[PDB]
Assembly symmetry: D2
Homo-oligomer: 121 residues x 4
């Protein structure tokens, strides 16, 4: 009944939006981009610490081609595909030392319906 | 659809074990101790950073009477009641610069049954 | 390394907004109301199932004096104090078979600052 | 400040173990299997409802080739690769109307170290 450092690290997860698997806009995405989104999402709290917050309170990223390279553990060929994929679906904004804005996904009445079916018997 | 620092801080919660509200051992506890447990639980990740990990990997706390005083925002009269309450139910171990070990709660077939009833219509 | 039903019920928590412990508007609240908020918050998913969703997509509650009585495990004397307390701080709306609207808390630059101090060394 | 059904479905995630991206045993896994693990993990609560709990309290799955086919949205060719991949790393047990046991991942001192580096600046 002790809290262990091992059980603690075993309970750390990246968060994959379930809508990535019901919404036609998103389902299309390569798993590399879906997972990339989840990994970047986890960094939001960091950005707040790095004070990467704009004038309106929006949280952004300042990552080079190499940063994302280590962060997502993939080559610049792949990350190029990743960014382009996420932007095409309005999941990312590169408002050009680049600035990246992660965006939350959209939800539709159908997503809801589907997400229910996906979460039940 | 931007992630905001405000929405981010608005989505930060202390975790209250639901079993604190079904198990007779725990229900008895004062809300001050239940909440105190939740607050301390949130500190586990800190302790790992402070390398407050024993030889077997268990995570502990090194908090003075004043630390807990600010951490739980209450007087030493109350925290005394808090510790004694949590220890009485094996939710805390003071293995005497004090060392505190938070413990996870117990679960019984009835807790499960009750927790189901509590989570449903 | 098996997932057990016991470990699963042991990892179920009510979510206590941390801002309830930094914002002056909220700190004032009795622990009964803070916890009551957390308990009710957990019911949101139920309401969606009961189709307790208004025209604008807002999620509400249809609970009698007895429902809340069992749900929060307390007497009608206490729940009266609870509702009045939560409404006074805009955490609840009783738009009178009653309808209850839970509301999310507010966040201020100070809450953020405080919440940082509360989450760190 | 209302809780909306849309914001509620927008905040639903599958949980990707971060160790899948630090431990050599796991990193190797195809994204299809990593995500498949996350999707199946989400079903644990269902299994409890279906009373898919063995004598020792372990939670299991009773899924046909078609069930997993719809659940993971992929062909039987892919799921074959998925199961074989997860079993090879002790993340799944097919104790043959099949029975599937999801297993939690392992953690090492290095995983911890890596997971820290992955979660920080």
């Amino acid at each position: 009944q002790f809290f262990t450092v091992e059980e603690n690290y075993k309970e750390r997860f990246y968060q994959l939006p379930k809508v990535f698997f019901t919404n036609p806009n998103y389902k299309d995405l390569s798993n590399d981009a879906k997972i990339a989104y989840a990994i970047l999402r986890d960094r939001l709290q960091l950005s707040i610490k790095n004070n990467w917050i704009d004038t309106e309170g929006n949280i952004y990223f300042i990552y080079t081609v190499a940063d994302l390279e280590v962060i997502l553990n993939c080559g610049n060929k792949k990350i190029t595909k990743i960014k382009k994929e996420l932007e095409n679906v309005d999941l990312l904004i590169q408002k050009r030392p680049n600035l990246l804005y992660l965006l939350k996904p959209a939800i539709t009445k159908n997503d809801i319906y589907e997400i229910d079916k996906a979460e039940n018997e």
